[PDB]
Amino acid sequence: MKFLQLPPRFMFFTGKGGVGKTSIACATSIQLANAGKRVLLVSTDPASNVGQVFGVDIGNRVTPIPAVPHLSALEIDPEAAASAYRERLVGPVRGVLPDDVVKGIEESLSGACTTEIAAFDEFTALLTNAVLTADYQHIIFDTAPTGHTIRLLQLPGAWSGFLEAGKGDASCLGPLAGLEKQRTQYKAAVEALADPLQTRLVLVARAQQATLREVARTHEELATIGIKQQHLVINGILPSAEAANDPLAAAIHEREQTALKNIPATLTSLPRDLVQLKPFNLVGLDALRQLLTDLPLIELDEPGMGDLVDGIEADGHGLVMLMGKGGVGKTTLAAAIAVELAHRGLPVHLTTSDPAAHLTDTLEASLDNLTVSRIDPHAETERYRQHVLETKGAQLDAEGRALLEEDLHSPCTEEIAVFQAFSRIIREAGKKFVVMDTAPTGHTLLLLDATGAYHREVRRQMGFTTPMMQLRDPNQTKVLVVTLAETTPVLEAAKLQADLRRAGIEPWAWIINTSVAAASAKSPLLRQRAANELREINAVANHHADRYAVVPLLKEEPIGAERLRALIHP
Numbered sequence: 305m306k307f308l309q310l311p312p313r314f315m316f317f318t319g320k321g322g323v324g325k326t327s328i329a330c331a332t333s334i335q336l337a338n339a340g341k342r343v344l345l346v347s348t349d350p351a352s353n354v355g356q357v358f359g360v361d362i363g364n365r366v367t368p369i370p371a372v373p374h375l376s377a378l379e380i381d382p383e384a385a386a387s388a389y390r391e392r393l394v395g396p397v398r399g400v401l402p403d404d405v406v407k408g409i410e411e412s413l414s415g416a417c418t419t420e421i422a423a424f425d426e427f428t429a430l431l432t433n434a435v436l437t438a439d440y441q442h443i444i445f446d447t448a449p450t451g452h453t454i455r456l457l458q459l460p461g462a463w464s465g466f467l468e469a470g471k472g473d474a475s476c477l478g479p480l481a482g483l484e485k486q487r488t489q490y491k492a493a494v495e496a497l498a499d500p501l502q503t504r505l506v507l508v509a510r511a512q513q514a515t516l517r518e519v520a521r522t523h524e525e526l527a528t529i530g531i532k533q534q535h536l537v538i539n540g541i542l543p544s545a546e547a548a549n550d551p552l553a554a555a556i557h558e559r560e561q562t563a564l565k566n567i568p569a570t571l572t573s574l575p576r577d578l579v580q581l582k583p584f585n586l587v588g589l590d591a592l593r594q595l596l597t598d599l600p601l602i603e604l605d606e607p608g609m610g611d612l613v614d615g616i617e618a619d620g621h622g623l624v625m626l627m628g629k630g631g632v633g634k635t636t637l638a639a640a641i642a643v644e645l646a647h648r649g650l651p652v653h654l655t656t657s658d659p660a661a662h663l664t665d666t667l668e669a670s671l672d673n674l675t676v677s678r679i680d681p682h683a684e685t686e687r688y689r690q691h692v693l694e695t696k697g698a699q700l701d702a703e704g705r706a707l708l709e710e711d712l713h714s715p716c717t718e719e720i721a722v723f724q725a726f727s728r729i730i731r732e733a734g735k736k737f738v739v740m741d742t743a744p745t746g747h748t749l750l751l752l753d754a755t756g757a758y759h760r761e762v763r764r765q766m767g768f769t770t771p772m773m774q775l776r777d778p779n780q781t782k783v784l785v786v787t788l789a790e791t792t793p794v795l796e797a798a799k800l801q802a803d804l805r806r807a808g809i810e811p812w813a814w815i816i817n818t819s820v821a822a823a824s825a826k827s828p829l830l831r832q833r834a835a836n837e838l839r840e841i842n843a844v845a846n847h848h849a850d851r852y853a854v855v856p857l858l859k860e861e862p863i864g865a866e867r868l869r870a871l872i873h874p
């Protein structure tokens with residue numbers, strides 16, 4: 305592998321959801337650890353699959369992997385990091401001062417800004433602090449889908465700029481934040497990210513046009529930020545030998561070859577590596593030790609997705625949130641549902657809270673009765689700033705208004721603006737269908753505001769029912785959990801369902817999308833994949849889900865109104 309030659313200290317793995325970031329990260333960390341180096345595999349994804357891949361319980365603590373010596377693992381959980389940050393800030397001042405002031409500080413540190421800054425502080429502490437990670441020669445960062453990994457990588461520069469612009473009194477974080485001490489750490493993280501000799505950025509993708517476009521956009525933005533040298537990995541390439549004497553495999557191979565030959569011009573210069581498709585899930589050391597190296601070489605009748613759309617229509621109005629793991633087909637299924645509902649003569653609003661929206665790509669047309677929209681972080685941040693200035697800024701004097709605007713310029717207000725837009729869009733589901741494609745599980749769970757941190761942060765600025773009061777009502781919401789027939793996707797879907805039920809939301813249905821089992825595959829590799837997928841399909845049908853639909857692996861990517869509406873009614 306080209307990206308494994310003379311690796312720098314750090315190695316990020318960024319790309320669209322479900323492209324193989326975690327699999328490649330684990331394989332590379334295992335390879336380096338076996339080579340003799342001491343590696344630390346950090347997972348910045350809030351919903352990390354590292355523990356499920358290695359079969360070890362990994363939390364917000366550096367836990368060695370017993371199976372492979374010299375390798376340690378870490379998962380940056382935002383909640384645990386926020387709790388540790390709050391403890392560090394409050395415990396030293398507890399007892400000395402009365403309970404009133406200390407509890408006030410605790411309440412002021414209980415917002416979403418505190419969680420975000422705690423996770424970011426842990427990330428930059430890993431990046432910069434040499435003593436903390438001196439024992440590890442390599443740190444392998446396995447990131448979430450690029451929609452939020454780009455934000456994470458931009459956060460050091462944004463915070464350094466905010467602090468260097470004479471802004472040390474962000475009232476969102478509270479007076480006890482003391483960000484002035486972390487200015488040097490933020491600048492060091494920025495320098496490390498922009499130094500090709502210290503950090504290597506690997507852009508994982510697939511032989512699909514959407515993933516390659518996403519990686520091209522990510523490469524453009526990250527090159528703008530300051531990362532110089534980047535590599536490219538194309539995961540999940542069907543071997544050419546499988547395309548013989550098989551319609552589905554031949555179509556997939558033709559599409560993937562066409563995608564490779566039309567790689568974006570910006571990514572044509574990056575050093576490229578190709579990882580084939582394997583007849584097994586990449587879970588465990590046995591499967592992970594043969595991921596980066598080329599391998600030396602069913603009658604399923606499940607419920608369709610038409611029943612789900614019929615049930616959704618029967619209500620006549622409400623919200624339909626397509627949650628699930630990244631890369632499972634949330635956008636495609638949301639677009640298909642919206643297109644089918646609009647084609648029936650009903651008013652539909654199709655929205656996407658993903659910071660990297662892919663709605664206009666999967667729709668490609670202005671359908672009748674369908675209103676497409678997205679939660680653009682920058683526009684929402686603007687709108688939030690003007691709203692706060694108009695509401696609260698009227699009373700303040702000129703100097704107070706300027707100070708309030710400088711406070712609102714802090715990077716963390718973007719997430720509160722996004723939450724405000726999300727709540728406003730949800731409030732529109734009382735009279736018309738609102739199909740909301742979501743981001744991956746890790747950040748969507750934070751967006752739902754189960755703990756009320758976002759609501760507290762909003763009402764602190766003083767600029768009405770919470771979103772949870774609607775997602776908890778089965779009569780005006782439907783949370784469809786989209787998963788694949790694979791091990792890790794089903795495990796993460798079950799974890800998402802458990803979290804939702806803990807929060808009070810009962811998912812309406814499950815969708816096993818792009819299952820080779822549903823389709824008829826004759827190549828040995830795809831037959832092995834279907835055989836492996838049968839067990840997960842059975843698990844989802846019997847245990848996890850009482851209402852579900854199975855969508856096969858279409859031989860042509862569903863794009864446009866016609867293809868999107870075809871998978872609803874095969």
Ligand SMILES: Nc1ncnc2c1ncn2[C@@H]1O[C@H](COP(=O)(O)OP(=O)(O)OP(=O)(O)O)[C@@H](O)[C@H]1O
Pocket residue numbers: 320321322449512514515629630631632633634635636637658662743744817818855856857858859860861862871
């Ligand atoms: N039934 C299907 N048959 C074949 N390909 C499919 C099918 N459903 C989805 N795909 C492919 O899955 C790819 C994944 O992109 P998609 O937007 O659907 O996923 P997502 O879960 O929204 O991703 P992200 O986590 O990156 O936001 C799409 O490019 C589409 O080509």
Ligand SMILES: Nc1ncnc2c1ncn2[C@@H]1O[C@H](COP(=O)(O)OP(=O)(O)OP(=O)(O)O)[C@@H](O)[C@H]1O
Pocket residue numbers: 320321322323324325326327328349353447448449539540541579580581582583584585586587595629630631744790791792793
């Ligand atoms: N080369 C490959 N061959 C076969 N299966 C693969 C390959 N690469 C990845 N997979 C499968 O992809 C599934 C999802 O990949 P992975 O766990 O790497 O997701 P991810 O990129 O971390 O996504 P997310 O951002 O949604 O967490 C895994 O179950 C693994 O089985």
Ligand SMILES: [As]
Pocket residue numbers: 417476477714716717
């Ligand atoms: As803030």
Ligand SMILES: [Mg+2]
Pocket residue numbers: 325326327349352353446447448
């Ligand atoms: Mg991952």
Ligand SMILES: [Mg+2]
Pocket residue numbers: 633634635636658662741742
């Ligand atoms: Mg999507």
